[PDB]
Amino acid sequence: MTDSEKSATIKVTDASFATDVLSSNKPVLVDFWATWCGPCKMVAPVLEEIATERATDLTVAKLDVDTNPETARNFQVVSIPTLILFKDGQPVKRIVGAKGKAALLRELSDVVPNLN
């Protein structure tokens, strides 16, 4: 990873989300969160670590509900963090509340081969 091979994770906005997430060929994991939220800060190292380590298998992105409520209503955020996994720009699963690396990567391994 470099300034051109930009380091993980990316951030998405209501004008660009459809090009960044829904136009992707990949598994794309999206976290709908706020930067002051306790369980949101608890997943910050987990989302950074999986996205830095597994960038060739999946992408991880974040949506800031504290400044963008318009994408937050799009996917019906009600508690945070809301984690939602897409594949080929189509939704597969949603979980709400904090994760560890093992649980996040296992529910990703359900969507593309890894634990085999």
UniProtKB/Swiss-Prot annotation:
Disulfide bonds: C37-C40
GO terms for MF: protein-disulfide reductase activity
Pfam family, one: Thioredoxin
Gene Ontology annotations for the cellular component aspect, listed alphabetically: cytosol
Top-level taxonomic group: Bacteria
Alphabetized InterPro entries for the sequence: Thioredoxin, Thioredoxin-like_sf, Thioredoxin_CS, Thioredoxin_domain
CDD domains on file: TRX_family (cd02947)
Keywords: Disulfide bond, Electron transport, Redox-active center, Transport
Every Thioredoxin domain range: 2-113
PROSITE patterns: THIOREDOXIN_1, THIOREDOXIN_2
GO biological process: cell redox homeostasis
PANTHER family, per the entry: GEO12009P1
Biological function: Participates in various redox reactions through the reversible oxidation of its active center dithiol to a disulfide and catalyzes dithiol-disulfide exchange reactions.
Family: Belongs to the thioredoxin family.
Protein name, per record: Thioredoxin
Gene this protein is translated from: trxA
